Symmetry: D2
């Protein structure tokens, strides 16, 4: 029987690339999504056309709230409903936008709920549910950020969320090791730039990258995820692999 | 004229020692408290006996909620009301207890308390503090030297303290143009929990290379005092460990 | 045509496993050794039995001295003379023993051996490798140590050498990225214990490891080296991958 | 009786500021120097004018070699000879220059100088200090930019990483003797004499806190704090003094 994986925010971009590669490797996948229903279903369709009954979609908002625990529990339950098991959890879904300290129409309470909920609290609750539900190679991969110690100006809540995720990666690695669940991270530097970013600003980032003066492809991020879930990483837990082409080594 | 400082969770233990030391250095102080009103007032009485009208108390829950932003604005406002300025913010108040991943507060309440006290309130207080400055201004965050070798079953607490490291660095970067420095002090074993059994306390004391004892609250406060002082005017985004070498000790 | 790799200190234990896996992946190999001639030759013969003319040995002391640069240049030269190319350098060879700060080798010899093997020889080998390089996938992998921030008592020079090696990994990643040469590390926690060590002392260490209460095999260390040199790590440079079973996350 | 401190490379710049502050704080000082004989002597004169018999100079090359251990021992011995005690060691002296990986000093000499001054000598000085043994401590001058290093400074950066390692390993090992071991890590402080002014201003402009370099005295302030009674529980810590520079992305 084939192992099964949950990938959060898997409709597009890096999350899709992770779902696709896990699928090519032989996993059945839960494609979690929030607003991108059309893309999520189009992805599932494609994967099912390749091997029938190997992909399902699963909608959930991962903003922090009193029901987020139930929503995270239901994501994991959806993987067991569809496939009878859940071997791998990839925490990819993430809000990312500035929250200047000194001054959209979002209240600060909402910005906290979204940026901290998606980047940290949902990963934690999903980790709890994943572990509670449990030959085998169980693991969790958290999508981190190589630039958290040299952060972009005015992104303090986003940065707080990614740091917390480093913390979860370490605490969970420690706590879940006795269950054979490994917990690791992958830290992109610049990978796929925001759709709203203009090409000139993209190029400015690209030129900072020592290894090729270009951003990581979605696939290059996915390759590191696939390593960490594989039997080639069976002694690795609590590790965060930078995939940044050297960006984080470059001084101001 | 005397500068003014806000210390969160200042009624007892390390926050009290920080408040006392700031006051002894010439600061006027806001003593924030949540449940410890009797202690906050007894401290303020003691400080005001030394110098009249140099200590006030301020009550607030720092649990994350819809009203936390307004509570944090008011903490900063209370300093401006009492003393006409706010030069120093010390983020010390903190919830601390285990949140096991695998199995009573509900988990969503644990998130609100642990992530609210250790990260979100410091963020909001940081915003309010800076907004009122939109001179030697600084913020000191009480961090934790053991965040990379955390105690078992303390995920949420650890997440909170890691977020606090992120805020320290992000805010140091962003508030530098205002001359507001942002730094941290990271204790290892200092005052042990009142509820911890005596034998467990000695087990932790025995691990500390430098003296086989915990840090006093005053030794923690000493690093805070350095960081707010004129001797640290080029230091921002720095977290000073005060741990007697504990974090260097392998398993 | 087959790529070629230099592995230092490859006669035994981790280095040998690295050489074997590289060879199994399709690399021709230079097996560098210092004192272990028989084991080095035994390995070369075994690999050449698999595929003729794909393994050579190279003898050299990597202790710091006036001749260390020429020795390192000659190691790299040996790979070019053997195979016409040198795609991968693995800095594995390492002296390891206590050097207490307070009171039969002299301290100047301890400095030379521990700092030479763990840092200076890697640096010199890195210069010589890059100098000879000024669809290729060139890279360097340094064998670091997951425990450098929680070091064993009385191992200061060894620890200093390994920290220096982290600095080299970072500095060389940055400086060699324009040449397409990636530079990374693998940081074991407890892997193969010293051959003399009593089982009872081995067990004290094994029991500290969250993930399975056992040390890493040489092969598990080699797996991470294989990933870093592979096509799946082509955006990874300046990264150190802990392979430690969560050991470094465990407080005193 | 007043405590005594050894400060390496104390004739100029940051080491000088540290020696001056220690002395103002009540220490007798050994002013170590290599080539700067004239500046060393002049500092000792200035300090002894303020308090007589409270400063001496001590000459030593801290390049790695087989006699470096003897030289390091002699620096510590000079403190005991002059003052009968040695309470504080500041490891400040340091070579700093590029050593590109791809092509008048030989590489042998570059390794000796960069690794000797930044790492090996601090190690040997630490050994001799401890062996000859109150508020005893060591402060190592580290570098806030070690994880975002200057291009083509691999040996220098290797030396400074090793120095972090020494700081940690020695804090651990010397704690049973009450000797604390800490670091201070500048970002941009006094720029090289040889650096052009255009390049100096390029670096200044990168510092979030004031768009200026640290003064020597601001670096010395952090050293003074770590040797002080206000840092009695602090060991194995490295205090960045960088105005936020290391937080700034490329
Ligand atoms: N791109 C980079 O250069 C880069 C750099 C560093 C780190 N990373 C990390 O790598 C991961 C992937 O990056 P990316 O650029 O591919 O991410 P992305 O496109 O910004 O976001 C991925 C998905 O997150 C989901 N998401 C957002 N808010 C959500 C909410 N409230 N509830 C549930 N889901 C939500 C969205 O799902 P819907 O579309 O379905 O609404 C979105 O498709 C992220 O964790 C990111 O922080 C990326
Ligand atoms: N003690 C140690 O060994 C140690 C080690 C590492 C780090 N630290 C850090 O150092 C700081 C002080 O440590 P400590 O041991 O002195 O702290 P503590 O005694 O555990 O807590 C300090 C105060 O935090 C306040 N607080 C807790 N929950 C709150 C809430 N929901 N809203 C508002 N205030 C709340 C409480 O005020 P009321 O009493 O008024 O309710 C409490 O007195 C903390 O940030 C801690 O994480 C301490
Ligand atoms: N084993 C572990 O648990 C562990 C933990 C952390 C890190 N590591 C790192 O992983 C790597 C492999 O470890 P290991 O346990 O396999 O190493 P090892 O067996 O101690 O040493 C490997 C080889 O290093 C060579 N070597 C020693 N001194 C040398 C010199 N002066 N010149 C030239 N070569 C010299 C020796 O070659 P000859 O035999 O030919 O003389 C030896 O076989 C090392 O870098 C080590 O520091 C290992
Ligand atoms: N300046 C900065 O921006 C900065 C940034 C990061 C870290 N730091 C660190 O802070 C410390 C002080 O910086 P700095 O700029 O003041 O240092 P510096 O002026 O570059 O060097 C200090 C002294 O080191 C001594 N020295 C050099 N080579 C020597 C050798 N072979 N043997 C003995 N002594 C030798 C020299 O002594 P003589 O003059 O007597 O020959 C020199 O006066 C250094 O460790 C440095 O690495 C400085
Ligand atoms: N959830 C999420 N997190 C992210 N970190 C991103 C990015 C980062 C793109 C970028 C990476 C480095 C510098 C400037 C921009 C682009 N889109 C993102 N989405
Ligand atoms: N808010 C808060 N945070 C904390 N980190 C603490 C402690 C920590 C006590 C302790 C420190 C190190 C190991 C084991 C226990 C005791 N009381 C605390 N209160
Ligand atoms: N060159 C070299 N470096 C090493 N770090 C080692 C070891 C380490 C074995 C060990 C690893 C962790 C805790 C206690 C012992 C065993 N043999 C080694 N050889
Ligand atoms: N021994 C020594 N070490 C150093 N690190 C320096 C410096 C550093 C000046 C500088 C600091 C940051 C970027 C570029 C230059 C200037 N002079 C120095 N001397």
């Amino acid at each position: 029987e084939a192992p099964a994986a949950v990938v959060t925010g898997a409709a597009k971009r890096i999350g899709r690339a992770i779902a696709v590669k896990l699928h090519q490797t032989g996993y059945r996948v839960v494609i979690h999504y929030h607003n991108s229903a059309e893309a999520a279903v189009s992805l599932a369709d494609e994967l099912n056309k390749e091997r029938s009954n190997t992909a399902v979609v699963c909608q959930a908002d991962l903003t922090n709230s009193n029901v987020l625990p139930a929503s995270c529990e239901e994501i994991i339950n959806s993987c067991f409903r569809a496939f009878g098991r859940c071997d791998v959890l990839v925490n990819n879904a993430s809000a990312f936008y500035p929250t200047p300290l000194v001054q959209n129409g979002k209240t600060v309470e909402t910005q906290v709920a979204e940026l901290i909920g998606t980047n940290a609290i949902a990963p934690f609750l999903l980790t709890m549910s994943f572990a509670q539900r449990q030959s085998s190679n169980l693991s969790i991969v958290n999508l981190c950020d190589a630039m958290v110690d040299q952060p972009c100006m005015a992104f303090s809540l986003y940065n707080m969320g990614k740091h917390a995720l480093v913390g979860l990666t370490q605490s969970a690695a420690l706590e879940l090791a006795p269950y054979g669940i490994r917990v690791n991270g992958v830290a992109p530097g610049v990978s796929l730039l925001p759709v709203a970013m203009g090409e000139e600003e993209k190029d400015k980032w690209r030129r900072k990258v020592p290894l090729g003066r270009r951003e990581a492809s979605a696939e290059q991020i996915a390759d590191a995820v696939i390593f960490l879930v594989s039997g080639s990483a069976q002694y690795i837990t609590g590790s965060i692999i930078k995939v940044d082409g050297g960006l984080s080594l470059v001084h101001a």
